[PDB]
Design a protein around this nucleic acid. Structure first.
Lengths: 105, 158
RNA sequence: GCCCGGAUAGCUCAGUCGGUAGAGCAGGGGAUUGAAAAUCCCCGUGUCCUUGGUUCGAUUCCGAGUCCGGGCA
RNA sequence: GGGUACGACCAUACUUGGCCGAAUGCACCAUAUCCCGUCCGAUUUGUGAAGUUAAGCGGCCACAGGCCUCGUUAGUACGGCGAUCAGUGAUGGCGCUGGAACCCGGGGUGUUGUACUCU
RNA sequence: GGCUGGGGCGGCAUAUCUGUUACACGACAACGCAGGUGUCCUAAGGCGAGCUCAGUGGGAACAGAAAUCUCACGUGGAACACAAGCGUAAAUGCUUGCUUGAUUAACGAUUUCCAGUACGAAUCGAGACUGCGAAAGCAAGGCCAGCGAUCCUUUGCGAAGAACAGGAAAUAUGAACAAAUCAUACCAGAGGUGUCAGAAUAAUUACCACAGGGAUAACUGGCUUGUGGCGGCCAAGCGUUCAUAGCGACGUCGCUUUUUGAUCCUUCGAUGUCGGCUCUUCCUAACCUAGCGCCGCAGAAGACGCUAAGGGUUGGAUUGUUCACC
RNA sequence: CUAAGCGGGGAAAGAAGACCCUGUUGAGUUUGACUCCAGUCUGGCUCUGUGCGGCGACUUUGGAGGUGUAGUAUAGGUGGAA
RNA sequence: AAAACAUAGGUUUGUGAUGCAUCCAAGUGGUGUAUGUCGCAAACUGAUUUCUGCCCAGUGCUCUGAAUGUCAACGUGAGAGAUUCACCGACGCGCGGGUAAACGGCGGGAGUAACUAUGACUCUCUUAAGGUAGCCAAAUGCCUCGUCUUCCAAUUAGAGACG
RNA sequence: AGCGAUGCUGACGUGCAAAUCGCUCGUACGAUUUGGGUAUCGGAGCGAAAGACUCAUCGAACCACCUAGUAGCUGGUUCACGUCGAAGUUUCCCUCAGGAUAGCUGGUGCUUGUCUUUAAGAAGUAUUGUGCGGUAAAGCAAAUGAUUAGAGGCAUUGGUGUUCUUGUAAUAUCGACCUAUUCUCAAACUUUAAAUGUGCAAACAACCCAGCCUUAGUUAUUUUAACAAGGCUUUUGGGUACAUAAGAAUUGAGGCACCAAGUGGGCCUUCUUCGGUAAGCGGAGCAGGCGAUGCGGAAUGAACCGCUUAGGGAUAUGUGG
RNA sequence: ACGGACCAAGGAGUCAAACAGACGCGCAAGGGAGGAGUAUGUAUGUGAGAACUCUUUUCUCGUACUGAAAGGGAGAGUGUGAUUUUACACCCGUGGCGUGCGCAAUUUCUCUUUUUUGUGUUUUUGCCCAACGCCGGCCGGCCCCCCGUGGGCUGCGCGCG
RNA sequence: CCAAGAGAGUAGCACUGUUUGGGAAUGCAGUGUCAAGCCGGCAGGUAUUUGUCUGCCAAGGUUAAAUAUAGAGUAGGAAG
C-alpha cells in the first residue's frame, strides 16, 4: 500500500480529547526477554537431560501480519497502536495517488 | 456440500426485479410507527445493512423497537422442535405493516360498533344474508352436450 | 537472529592532519594497419542503492529503515 | 376550470407524429455593470429590461407507437388426489382437487391532494 | 494424516467463497456442474458538488476502420480493485472538489452460520471526536470470500495536580519493613495455525508381528450388459442384368452372455490360485453325419437355408500356457 | 437292512487367512526423518615447578608529536588573554 | 545346494608403538601382538587369460589447505547494583585445494548423393563427463515370438547371426 | 568305510519318526572324521554368513518377575412378570469400526386445570383474513442466451458478369449487409406464472369514555400545545362484550420441569431427483416403512396386500378366495 | 457367516471420593463429633473404634458475597422527611400471577346446611414472570474537562435467614 | 574489678546435572570456585542493590516414650 506518515486524527488523551495531529508510524516488535517470566519458566523446563520438549510449528499458511501503526499525538504523551488488514504490501510515506490521464504509452 | 456467505445469493430472488428497481419511496419514509406493530419483512437491497439474512421476507413478526433509522423485529424462527424469537436490527427501510391482523380487529370493532349500535346506540340495521340454500326454479331454456366430432373437418389438429 | 560483500557509470571501484566526484570498462568515434592481423588515442556514463548527519561551505566527512549475498542458531 | 405552484401517488402518466391554444402563469427571450461563474453568460452566477409564442409549455389529435385493462384461451396445459389399472417404456389412464403463460378480442389511456392564482 | 466407490495414485470435494444442483418458503448429498479465496486498495477510504454509460449515427485538415474534434442518439445493454453473484443511472456509476469515521469507546444491544457453542463475519444504538456539506444529512474503509483458540511473547494503558487521613475519597502485587531497580499485574491489541477448533514427525519390510474387519480389495456366485459376442429391421448401394443369388452401406431396433467391464450382495474364527492331464455328462447359436428348401447350383463345385444335438468330431511341432501357431 | 467298495458332496476336514484393508496396534530392517545418544574431535580451564629472556598492562617529562584555497601568514581548534 | 558364499588369483586405504587397529563400568582393563611393513589392520575384486575407457560437476572422502567469513564455552573491559554491551574467541564450518579398482555418473539438436537407397560426410544445442574398450534379443532388450540365417515333417524352442 | 544329502516332487505324511524310511546320489587324503579337555551367550555370541545357528526355544534364545501390563477391538457376559419405550440423525475432533454433543428415551417431577371453553391454553388442520416465490407451466415474434429458411431494402466495387476503360458505373448479377418475416430451443435464460407448499393473523392481559400521573421523549414553546410516550384510574374511575344478518373442528388436559440413558454402520418403499449406458449400481429430496412384530393375504419372499397384537369366547368382516 | 459332540461342578458388572439428582432418614442456620479423650461396671472384661456414651476445648464444614489485587461489601429496609452525607419512624421493594381468604348474587335448607351463581380482595418466598432497587464491579457520568441534582456499563452477588 | 574461651575447601558462589509442589531454584551430588571487620553469621517463599526492621545461631558429637511391620517374619492369645 501506501498510507500517510503524519496524520490529523483523534487523541482522547489527558492533554485533551480532540482530533489532533499525530505523527504516524508503523510498528515493529519489542520482542521477548531473557529473565522474562515466561522465559524463566521456559528455561526451567528446558534444563537437564531430556531431548527437546515442544511444538515447533511449521505451518505458514499465508504471509500476512497485521500491520500496526504507532501513532503519537504530539502533546499527548500518548502512543497508540492501530491495526491494518493482512497485507502483502505496505507503505507509509505520505505520498498520494494521481489519477492516470496521460499514459506515456 | 455448499459455500456460505451470510448474504449468500440466489437466482432470481434478491435481484431487485420488474421495473421495481431503485430507492425506496418517500412514501415509504413518511410512514410512522409505534411498536408492537405486526409488520412484515421484505428486502430492498438498497443498503446492504439492516438487512436480514434469508429467513425473513414473507414472514410476519412484531416490532419491539424503533431506533433512529431502524426498527427491531422479533420473529419466530422455527428450530428443531420450536420457534425461537429472534430480534433483528433493521433500518426502517426493509419492513412494513400488513393487514393480517388489521382486518380482524377492524371488523371486530366495526362489528362491535354495530353490535353496540344495535342494542344500545340508536338504530337498527340489516347486513348480509345467511350462507347457501335451495330454491323454486322457473328456467327457460335448458341445453345438454354433444361434444367432439360433428363438423370436426372444420377444426382439430391437421 | 546475529556476520557481512555488494546498492556508483555497461559492468566494477577512491576525495589537504575539514577543497571534492573515480579509473577500469562495456561504449563510441577516430587513429594505426593496402584493407587485414596486431595495436593505439579518444568518446559515453553515477541520486555515489535507499534515505538521514556535523558546517560560512559537506556523495568530501557521516546516519540509517533497505537491498542483498554468503555462516550458526 | 385552468393556471400557478408544492406535490403525493409513480407509465392508462410512455415513445411518435399532427392539430390547436384565452387567462393567470409558465416559457422562450435580452443582458452582463454589480455579484457570480464560466475556454465559453451554453450552463451557472448576477441584472432583467426589448422581443416572442416559433419553440417550450399546455390540450387535443392520431385504422399513431406504447402502456393500461378486461375478456379470450384453457380446466386444455399444468398441478393435486389414488392400493387402482393398462402399458416395452415413458406413459397413458379414471374418478376425487386445484389450476395456467402466450394468443386474440374488447375496452381503456394518468389519478388525485395541499397552497396560490386567474371571473 | 485423512480424504478415497480397495489400498495406492491422483485429486482436494480437508478452512473456504460463488453460482448452479434442489422440487417457486425454509432446509438437502456426490472425488456433481460451473467458478473463486489466502490478496488488493490513502483511496480503490470517507464526504459534497459536478458530471453520465455500454453502445449507435452524422460531420469535421492530416486521420483512413482505428487519433481527436464535434453534433447527435442511446434504461446501462455499462461501469462499478478483483471470483462469482447480487444491486444500481440527475446514482451506487463517473469526474472533480474537500477530507480522515479504515478514527475512538462504557461499547452494551443485535444477527448469521449454529450446538441455537464458537469464531469468523454482519447488523443496531449510545459517546466521543472528526469529515463533509446549503442543508437534511452522510460518513464506524461496495455488499457479499479474502482468514485464525488455549498456550506463549510482545506492543500499547495517567503525567499533571489536590492527601487531612484517602483532595476524582489518589490504577494493582511482589506477604517482616524500607528505598531503589527488576519482575508480576489488571486490560486491549499484535504475533499462527490452509489437515484452516488449532499434535513437534521419514523410510522399508517378499524376514515380518498383532488385532480385527467380509463394515474393504484379491476367486466363484450374484445384478447389469457399457464393453465384447450374436440376430434382425430398415435398405442406399452393391453385385455384367442386378435393392434383397448373395449381400448390405447409411441407418436403426433386437438378442446373448463360453467376453470384458462396472458394481462389493456374500465370502477374511477360510469355499485349496494356473494350466494341463484324466473323466463324465450336459447345452446348441450343427462343424461332420440323416433328410428337406435356395442358389448369381448346367455338370463340376460350392453357397444359402431349413429340419436336425440321436451320432461323430484327431496326431504332432513349437510354445507353462491360455491364446497363438505350423 | 447292509458288506465291501467308493472319494461327488457334505460351500468335508484341516488351520480364529499368513494376501488384502483397516487399526491414533506392533516390530525386524533403512535413511539427509523428528528427536536424542554412545561415540569421535576441538577448545577452555587445570595439575605446574624451575629459569633466563620477548610482547602486554600500568601513567610519569610531555618530547619525535599536526600547514587545502585565499590570508607573502604557522589551520581540530578550544579558552583566562591584552 | 546353486549361477550363492568360501577360494587362490585381482585392487586400494588405513597404519610404524606416548602407534595404528581394536575391545572396555572402571582400572596400571582387554585384544591385534609372547607382536613390527616380507608388519598389521581395513575393505573391495574374485582361478588362469586378457583388458580395464571417459567423468571429480554432483555426492562423499581427502587436503599438511588456504587463512581472518564464521563458529561454544572461554576470557577481557566497560553502569547504584543487578544488570548490560562490547571486543576476545577453538576445532569445525565458510573457504581453498586434492580425489573415481569412493559413491556413483558417463546427452541431446540439424542437414547432406543430381540413380538408387543409404548418409560415411558436415553443421547444432548442450554435460562433470556426456559411455570409450567391449559385449547382446545375451540370467541383461521394454517393444518382442524384434529380424534374418541356420536346424525339424512342421521349431513362441535351439543354435548361428543380427544387437 | 565314512561324512553329507541330489532325484524319485520315492516311501510315510494321525509315520517305527516332532523331519522317519527306500533307493538314488555328493564326496571320500583332505580347507579330511571324530572322542575328551578347553572358550565365545542375548539387542549378545557365534556365524566358510543362510540374518544360519545359538538344547525340538530363535529377523531378538530360554527362566522367574513387573503383569491381571495396555485395547477406540473379537468373544463371553449366569431369575420372573408387569409398565413405558428408541437411533442410524445434529456439531467438533490428527476426526471415518471411536467420542463428545445434540436429538430421540425412560424415569422422576412441579403449578393448575377444560362440561360455562363467544374469553383453558393448545392443535403437525381447515376457514377467513392476511402475508409470500420463480419449480412445473409459459415464452423466445420480450430481453438474456441459443437457431433455420426464404421475402422486402440499403451498399460504401462481398463476389459475380455484360453494356460499358472500368468506374465511388450503368445494367444485369449473386452474394454480403439493412429489415420485417421466419423454424427450432435453455440446468446455471427469462416476462408472465402455477398447482403443490411456505409467514402471520383470528380475543379480555380486550374496546371505549373520562381524567388522571409522569418524563433531564420531540435544536422547545408544555400547559388550559401538540404529539410522543407510558403510568394510572375505589364500586371499571366510568362505560363496554363475542349472533350473523352472515363462515370451523378439535381440544380423553394444559402449563411447566428435573435428571439420567440407550443410540451415532442402517437398510427397504410411493413420490421427486443427481451421477453414469447401465446395474438388485452409485448418489441426494420428501413421506413411510423395515430395522426393532408378529397375525391375515401375495404357491415363495425383511420392507408387497391386508392388518398389528392382553388372554379367551361368541359373531362378522379385511386382504384374499 | 462364526461358535456350538455330551453330563456334573464351576464360570463374568465388584468394592469405593468429592461430587449431580432421587428417595427415606436426622437436625436445623447450624449441622455434622469426630481426632480424641475421659468415664463409671454387665462383670471375661470394661470403668465397652465396635457398649453406653458422655463431652468441655470446640474442630470441621455449613449459616453474604464480590474483587487478580490492593480491597471492599447487601433490611443502598421500608417508609419517611428528605436540599435524603443526614435525620426521623419502624409489625410486606415496585408491577404481572396467587391454590387462599373476603363479599354479593344463587339452591335447597327453618335457621343451620347450603347446593349453585355473581364478584371482591390479598407480598413476587406459594411459583414464576416483569421492572427497579441493592453489594462488589466497571466506565464515572452531565459536561469542553471535572464535581455535585445525579450517572451510565457489568457480575458465580443481594432483595423479607 | 576482668573475662567473657560455640564447628571451613565447610558455609557460600558459579557451573553442570539431578532432584523438588518449592515457584528468577526443595535438596543433593560432581566439578570449579570458595566466606566471618567478627557494627557477626544464618533465616524472614519475585530476581537485585540498597537499607532497616523481624526470627534464630548451622556447619563435630549422643538422646526413651508415644509409631511401624506393609505380605516371606518368631514366642504366646483372641477371633471372624
Amino acid at each position: 500500500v501506501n498510507y500517510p506518515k503524519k496524520k490529523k486524527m483523534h487523541c482522547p488523551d489527558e492533554r485533551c480529547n480532540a482530533h489532533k495531529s499525530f505523527k504516524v508510524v508503523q510498528y515493529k516488535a519489542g520482542k521477548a526477554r531473557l529473565y522474562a517470566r515466561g522465559k524463566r519458566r521456559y528455561d526451567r523446563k528446558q534444563s537437564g537431560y531430556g531431548g527437546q520438549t515442544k511444538p515447533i510449528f511449521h505451518k505458514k499458511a499465508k504471509t500476512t501480519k497485521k500491520i500496526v501503526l504507532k501513532l503519537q499525538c504530539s502533546n499527548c504523551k500518548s502512543i497508540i497502536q492501530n491495526v491494518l488488514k493482512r497485507t502483502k504490501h505496505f507503505e507509509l510515506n505520505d505520498k498520494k495517488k494521481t489519477g492516470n490521464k496521460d499514459p506515456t504509452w | 456440500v455448499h459455500s456460505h456467505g451470510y448474504k449468500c445469493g440466489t437466482r432470481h430472488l434478491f435481484a431487485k426485479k420488474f421495473r421495481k428497481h431503485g430507492v425506496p419511496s418517500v412514501s415509504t419514509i413518511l410512514t410512522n410507527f409505534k411498536v408492537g406493530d405486526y409488520v412484515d419483512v421484505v428486502a430492498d437491497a438498497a443498503v446492504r445493512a439492516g438487512m436480514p439474512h434469508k429467513y425473513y421476507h414473507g414472514r410476519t413478526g412484531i416490532v419491539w423497537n424503533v431506533t433512529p433509522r431502524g426498527v427491531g423485529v422479533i420473529i419466530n424462527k422455527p428450530v428443531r422442535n420450536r420457534t425461537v424469537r429472534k430480534r433483528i436490527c433493521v433500518r426502517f427501510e426493509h419492513v412494513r405493516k400488513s393487514r393480517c391482523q388489521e382486518a380482524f380487529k377492524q371488523k371486530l370493532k366495526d362489528l362491535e360498533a354495530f353490535r353496540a349500535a344495535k342494542k344500545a346506540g340508536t338504530p337498527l340495521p340489516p347486513k348480509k344474508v345467511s350462507t347457501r340454500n335451495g330454491g323454486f326454479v322457473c328456467p327457460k331454456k335448458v341445453e345438454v352436450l354433444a361434444r367432439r366430432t360433428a363438423d370436426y373437418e372444420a377444426m382439430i389438429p391437421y
